[PDB]
Protein backbone atom coordinates (compact mmCIF):
# COMPACT_ATOMS: atom_id res chain seq x y z
CA UNK A 1 0.00 0.00 0.00
CA UNK A 2 0.82 3.74 -0.16
CA UNK A 3 3.11 4.92 2.67
CA UNK A 4 1.29 6.32 5.72
CA UNK A 5 1.15 10.11 6.08
CA UNK A 6 -0.58 10.09 9.46
CA UNK A 7 0.97 12.53 11.93
CA UNK A 8 2.47 11.02 15.09
CA UNK A 9 4.64 12.94 17.55
CA UNK A 10 5.43 9.68 19.30
CA UNK A 11 7.64 9.13 22.33
CA UNK A 12 9.99 12.03 21.61
CA UNK A 13 7.37 14.70 20.91
CA UNK A 14 8.42 14.96 17.27
CA UNK A 15 7.28 18.11 15.47
CA UNK A 16 8.42 19.99 12.36
CA UNK A 17 9.41 23.64 12.24
CA UNK A 18 10.37 26.09 9.51
CA UNK A 19 12.23 29.41 9.43
CA UNK A 20 10.04 32.50 9.50
CA UNK A 21 11.60 33.67 6.24
CA UNK A 22 8.87 35.89 4.81
CA UNK A 23 8.04 36.29 1.13
CA UNK A 24 10.57 38.72 -0.39
CA UNK A 25 11.68 38.03 -3.97
CA UNK A 26 15.11 36.83 -2.83
CA UNK A 27 13.74 34.02 -0.63
CA UNK A 28 14.44 30.52 -1.96
CA UNK A 29 12.37 28.72 0.69
CA UNK A 30 9.27 30.01 2.49
CA UNK A 31 6.75 28.13 4.59
CA UNK A 32 3.06 28.96 4.95
CA UNK A 33 1.79 28.11 8.46
CA UNK A 34 -1.77 28.72 7.28
CA UNK A 35 -1.37 26.19 4.47
CA UNK A 36 1.21 23.84 5.99
CA UNK A 37 2.98 24.26 2.67
CA UNK A 38 6.58 25.00 1.68
CA UNK A 39 7.32 27.09 -1.41
CA UNK A 40 10.85 26.65 -2.71
CA UNK A 41 13.23 27.00 -5.65
CA UNK A 42 14.76 24.08 -7.57
CA UNK A 43 18.08 22.91 -6.10
CA UNK A 44 18.06 25.64 -3.44
CA UNK A 45 18.59 25.12 0.30
CA UNK A 46 15.34 24.14 2.03
CA UNK A 47 15.75 24.17 5.84
CA UNK A 48 13.43 21.80 7.69
CA UNK A 49 13.48 21.81 11.49
CA UNK A 50 13.09 18.84 13.80
CA UNK A 51 11.68 19.69 17.23
CA UNK A 52 11.59 17.11 20.02
CA UNK A 53 10.49 17.11 23.66
CA UNK A 54 13.08 14.44 24.43
CA UNK A 55 16.37 13.60 22.68
CA UNK A 56 16.33 10.44 20.53
CA UNK A 57 19.47 8.33 21.12
CA UNK A 58 22.32 8.45 18.54
CA UNK A 59 21.71 5.95 15.77
CA UNK A 60 18.30 7.53 15.20
CA UNK A 61 17.62 8.29 11.53
CA UNK A 62 15.49 10.88 9.71
CA UNK A 63 13.86 9.91 6.42
CA UNK A 64 12.17 12.07 3.78
CA UNK A 65 9.84 10.88 1.01
CA UNK A 66 7.59 12.57 -1.55
CA UNK A 67 4.10 11.31 -2.45
CA UNK A 68 1.32 12.69 -4.65
CA UNK A 69 -1.50 14.46 -2.81
CA UNK A 70 -4.44 13.54 -5.04
CA UNK A 71 -5.89 10.06 -4.45
CA UNK A 72 -5.80 9.17 -8.16
CA UNK A 73 -2.03 9.72 -8.27
CA UNK A 74 -1.08 8.37 -4.83
CA UNK A 75 0.07 4.99 -6.16
CA UNK A 76 2.42 6.63 -8.65
CA UNK A 77 6.04 6.98 -7.52
CA UNK A 78 7.16 10.61 -7.35
CA UNK A 79 10.29 10.95 -9.46
CA UNK A 80 12.18 13.52 -11.52
CA UNK A 81 11.27 14.42 -15.10
CA UNK A 82 13.26 12.92 -18.04
CA UNK A 83 14.99 16.27 -18.67
CA UNK A 84 16.27 16.66 -15.12
CA UNK A 85 16.82 12.93 -14.57
CA UNK A 86 19.18 13.06 -17.57
CA UNK A 87 20.79 16.47 -17.01
CA UNK A 88 23.79 15.25 -14.98
CA UNK A 89 23.40 17.42 -11.85
CA UNK A 90 23.96 14.51 -9.48
CA UNK A 91 26.38 15.12 -6.61
CA UNK A 92 27.76 11.58 -6.86
CA UNK A 93 25.56 10.27 -4.04
CA UNK A 94 21.97 10.97 -5.05
CA UNK A 95 20.41 8.78 -7.73
CA UNK A 96 19.57 11.03 -10.73
CA UNK A 97 15.89 10.01 -10.47
CA UNK A 98 15.43 11.17 -6.87
CA UNK A 99 13.43 14.37 -6.37
CA UNK A 100 14.65 14.97 -2.82
CA UNK A 101 18.30 15.31 -1.83
CA UNK A 102 20.10 16.38 1.34
CA UNK A 103 22.97 18.84 0.99
CA UNK A 104 25.80 19.32 3.48
CA UNK A 105 25.76 15.81 4.94
CA UNK A 106 28.33 13.17 3.95
CA UNK A 107 26.39 10.53 5.89
CA UNK A 108 23.36 10.89 3.61
CA UNK A 109 21.77 7.62 2.45
CA UNK A 110 19.45 6.98 -0.50
CA UNK A 111 16.95 4.18 -0.97
CA UNK A 112 15.02 2.67 -3.84
CA UNK A 113 12.52 0.48 -2.00
CA UNK A 114 12.86 -3.08 -3.28
CA UNK A 115 9.11 -3.67 -3.11
CA UNK A 116 7.40 -0.31 -3.63
CA UNK A 117 10.09 1.30 -5.83
CA UNK A 118 9.66 4.55 -3.91
CA UNK A 119 12.56 6.91 -3.33
CA UNK A 120 13.62 8.24 0.06
CA UNK A 121 16.61 9.99 1.59
CA UNK A 122 17.86 9.44 5.15
CA UNK A 123 20.32 11.16 7.46
CA UNK A 124 21.46 10.43 11.04
CA UNK A 125 19.57 12.45 13.65
CA UNK A 126 21.89 14.91 15.39
CA UNK A 127 20.83 16.93 18.47
CA UNK A 128 20.25 20.72 18.15
CA UNK A 129 23.33 22.75 17.14
CA UNK A 130 24.64 25.58 19.32
CA UNK A 131 22.24 28.53 19.19
CA UNK A 132 19.14 26.58 18.19
CA UNK A 133 16.51 24.51 20.01
CA UNK A 134 15.77 22.40 16.93
CA UNK A 135 17.74 20.20 14.51
CA UNK A 136 17.94 21.51 10.93
CA UNK A 137 18.21 19.46 7.73
CA UNK A 138 18.92 21.12 4.38
CA UNK A 139 16.82 19.49 1.65
CA UNK A 140 16.98 20.10 -2.09
CA UNK A 141 14.11 19.46 -4.49
CA UNK A 142 15.53 18.68 -7.93
CA UNK A 143 12.42 19.23 -10.06
CA UNK A 144 9.90 22.03 -10.49
CA UNK A 145 6.24 21.28 -9.79
CA UNK A 146 5.66 22.56 -13.33
CA UNK A 147 8.02 20.00 -14.90
CA UNK A 148 6.25 18.22 -17.75
CA UNK A 149 6.82 14.48 -17.77
CA UNK A 150 7.38 14.52 -14.03
CA UNK A 151 5.07 15.97 -11.39
CA UNK A 152 3.40 18.02 -14.15
CA UNK A 153 1.78 20.50 -11.73
CA UNK A 154 0.44 17.69 -9.55
CA UNK A 155 0.70 18.66 -5.84
CA UNK A 156 2.95 16.58 -3.56
CA UNK A 157 3.58 16.00 0.15
CA UNK A 158 6.90 15.47 1.85
CA UNK A 159 6.71 12.89 4.64
CA UNK A 160 9.32 13.14 7.39
CA UNK A 161 9.74 10.06 9.56
CA UNK A 162 11.84 9.53 12.67
CA UNK A 163 13.12 5.95 12.95
CA UNK A 164 15.57 4.15 15.23
CA UNK A 165 18.73 2.30 14.16
CA UNK A 166 16.66 -0.87 13.71
CA UNK A 167 14.03 0.77 11.52
CA UNK A 168 11.33 1.08 14.18
CA UNK A 169 8.93 3.98 13.60
CA UNK A 170 9.33 6.71 16.25
CA UNK A 171 7.39 9.60 14.75
CA UNK A 172 5.93 11.09 11.58
CA UNK A 173 5.00 14.48 10.19
CA UNK A 174 4.35 15.94 6.75
CA UNK A 175 4.02 19.13 4.71
CA UNK A 176 2.96 20.08 1.19
CA UNK A 177 5.62 21.50 -1.11
CA UNK A 178 5.47 23.54 -4.31
CA UNK A 179 8.72 23.88 -6.26
CA UNK A 180 8.70 27.08 -8.31
CA UNK A 181 10.67 30.09 -9.57
CA UNK A 182 9.06 32.67 -7.28
CA UNK A 183 8.22 30.98 -3.94
CA UNK A 184 7.47 34.25 -2.12
CA UNK A 185 5.04 35.33 -4.83
CA UNK A 186 3.32 31.92 -4.94
CA UNK A 187 2.90 31.88 -1.16
CA UNK A 188 1.18 35.28 -1.12
CA UNK A 189 -1.06 34.25 -4.02
CA UNK A 190 -2.13 30.95 -2.49
CA UNK A 191 -2.74 32.56 0.92
CA UNK A 192 -5.06 35.24 -0.48
CA UNK A 193 -7.01 32.55 -2.34
ZN1 LIG B 1 12.05 18.29 -13.88
Curated annotation (Swiss-Prot):
Outcome following mutation: residue 190 to D: In sporadic cancers; somatic mutation
Outcome reported for the amino acid change (mutating residue 57 to T): In sporadic cancers; somatic mutation
Consequence when changing residue 175 to S: In sporadic cancers; somatic mutation
Effect caused by changing residue 77 to A: In sporadic cancers; somatic mutation
Effect of residue 176 to Q: In sporadic cancers; somatic mutation
Effect of residue 79 to T: In a sporadic cancer; somatic mutation
Outcome of swapping residue 188 to G: In sporadic cancers; somatic mutation
Outcome, altering residue 31 to F: In a sporadic cancer; somatic mutation
Impact when changing residue 53 to G: In a sporadic cancer; somatic mutation
Effect of residue 24 to D: In a sporadic cancer; somatic mutation
Result for mutant: residue 10 to D: In sporadic cancers; somatic mutation
Effect of mutating residue 141 to F: In a sporadic cancer; somatic mutation
Effect recorded for residue 53 to V: In sporadic cancers; somatic mutation
Effect of residue 155 to N: In sporadic cancers; somatic mutation; requires 2 nucleotide substitutions
Effect of residue 186 to R: In a sporadic cancer; somatic mutation; requires 2 nucleotide substitutions
Result, substituting residue 192 to D: In sporadic cancers; somatic mutation
Name of the protein in its database record: Cellular tumor antigen p53
Gene that this polypeptide is encoded by: TP53
Amino acid sequence: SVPSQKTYQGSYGFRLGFLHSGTAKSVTCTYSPALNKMFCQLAKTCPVQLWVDSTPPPGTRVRAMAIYKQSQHMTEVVRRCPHHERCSDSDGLAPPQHLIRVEGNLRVEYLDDRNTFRHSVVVPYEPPEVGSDCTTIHYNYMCNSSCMGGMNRRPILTIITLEDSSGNLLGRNSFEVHVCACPGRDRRTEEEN
